[PDB]
Amino acid sequence: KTVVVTTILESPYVMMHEMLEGNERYEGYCVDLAAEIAKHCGFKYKLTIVGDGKYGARDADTKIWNGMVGELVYGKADIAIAPLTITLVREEVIDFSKPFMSLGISIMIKKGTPIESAEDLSKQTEIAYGTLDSGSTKEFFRRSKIAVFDKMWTYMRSAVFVRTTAEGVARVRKSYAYLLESTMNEYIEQRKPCDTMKVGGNLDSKGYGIATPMGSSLGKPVNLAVLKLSEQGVLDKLKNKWWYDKGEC
Amino acid sequence: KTVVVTTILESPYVMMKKHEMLEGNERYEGYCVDLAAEIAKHCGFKYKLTIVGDGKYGARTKIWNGMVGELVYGKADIAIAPLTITLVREEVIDFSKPFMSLGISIMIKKGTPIESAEDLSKQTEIAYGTLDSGSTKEFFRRSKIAVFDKMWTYMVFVRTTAEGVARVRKSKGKYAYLLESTMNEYIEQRKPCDTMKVGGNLDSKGYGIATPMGSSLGKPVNLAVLKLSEQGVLDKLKNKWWYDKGEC
Ligand SMILES: N[C@@H](CCC(=O)O)C(=O)O
Ligand SMILES: N[C@@H](CCC(=O)O)C(=O)O
Ligand SMILES: [Zn+2]
Ligand SMILES: [Zn+2]
Ligand SMILES: [Zn+2]
Ligand SMILES: [Zn+2]
């Protein structure tokens, strides 16, 4: 039967189309990845953009998951192929593949902003900064016990958050610093109008994983699929294809 | 009931303490020792540490040996060691999210005129090899990359990493050792400080906590690994066993 694949519109992972029908509406890293995984695992699939346009978090009172994690937990989709960050709270409710891409939280600034590091952000007030409202980065700052980061969190929760990455980029370009993951950051660094740059090293190191509902029969297949693709050099080729082979700066 | 943890004597992951007077898991110190203790603490089980019988990591008479074998054939309940996550291993056992990153790298005696793998593949005066049962040797065996099929075609193997290191140190630069960057970088800061890593890594892969396929332990050890990483325990531990003990 057709596997329902949940995913999110996020460049260059999944991108737009009005005249097309199907998965063919979309292009990108996770699109090609979906196709390869499907090729090696031998199933048919339908790509579907996560309903609330979010990655996934749990509301602390209502205790319900949103975003792609929610659509996995509540049986609305059979698999998530996306820049979905492997985190503890998520592993608590769903299954993750071995990571298929490395990344870390990093700072994006408008070219010319006098910022060198996260500590620089934590020591000042003139430049605002925030993260994605539902997502692993915000959870990182919320739960962080590091002085600089607890300080930044203390600022942020009381101040700066955006609903989508595009809103964060737009907010930076029209200003404000944006805290976002290095992969998406570096991708935008090579995008017109070429007015943003990454500053400082990454704040942490984690990975993107393929996600299935906890206990799904697909976990092993998608997991040997990811490992196969990695060892065959397919993943490096895909990143090269969508990041650097299309750099506009 | 007691969980049997299979592991391998490999510095700084699992080592004999300065042990004859001791009994138990207390016989050992090292990265994977601390890691095991934390994993057990967060998963709430008791465990007995056991050194893999044939001292091997795992390869496939079609029978698995080493820690992979001891998992497949029910000799241990979990492997906590520098055991590399690979496709062929995933085919037969389960792996946690990786708790450490690493890549294949070249170890040479200080003064050897070698910069990269291509240089090794292009010459004959300096011999080179890998661990006999292990993921590196498999990497070269299965590599479809020209240089690496060339090196494999050439390839000199050792039974333990210590034999490879000793071979490097006693070969007067006529032998290079192909081994994982973590272990390389570790030996790099160890007396007699006569070895160095050359070139970048040949690949990028990981070490994982392993369980027999379908074990109820996979999930627990996997949330434990994710917690430990996120709480900074892993970075602290690597700092502890690698760099806080650097002799150069
Ligand atoms: N990849 C993140 C979303 C992006 C971000 O938070 O910066 C997640 O899985 O939650
Ligand atoms: N970590 C490797 C052994 C060391 C090596 O092959 O260099 C493995 O799990 O097979
Ligand atoms: Zn449209
Ligand atoms: Zn393929
Ligand atoms: Zn001893
Ligand atoms: Zn602890």
Residue numbers in the entry:
A (entry chain B): 393 to 408, 412 to 506, 555, 566, 632 to 677, 681 to 696, 700 to 773
B (entry chain A): 393 to 410, 412 to 453, 457 to 506, 555, 566, 632 to 674, 681 to 773
Quote the study that presented this structure, word for word.
In order to incorporate an additional electrostatic interaction across the D1-D1 interface, we used a Thr765 to Lys mutation to introduce a charged tether onto residues forming the opposing electronegative pocket (for additional rationale). Alone, this mutation had little functional effect, but coupled with the K759M mutation (K759M/T765K), current decay slowed several fold, and the additional mutation N768T (creating K759M/T765K/N768T, or MKT) yielded nondecaying current responses. In contrast, crystals of the GluA2 K759M/T765K LBD were successfully grown in the presence of zinc, and a dataset was collected from a single crystal at 2.9 Å resolution. Three protomers were present in the asymmetric unit, of which chains A and B formed a canonical dimer, and the third, C, formed a dimer with its symmetry-related counterpart. In each dimer (A:B and C:C′) electron density was visible for both the mutant Met and Lys residues, and the latter residue was spanning the dimer interface as predicted. Electrostatic interactions were formed between the amine group on residue 765 (i.e., T765K) and the sidechain carboxyl group of Asp511, as well as the backbone oxygen atom of Ile510. In addition to these contacts, there was a general shift in the dimer conformation, with the apical residues having moved closer together relative to structures of wild-type GluA2, forming a more extensive, contiguous interface. Consistent with functional recordings of GluA2 K759M/T765K, our structural data also suggest that the crossdimer tether does not persist indefinitely. Overall, these structural and functional data support the premise that the Lys tether is not a permanent feature of the T765K mutant series.
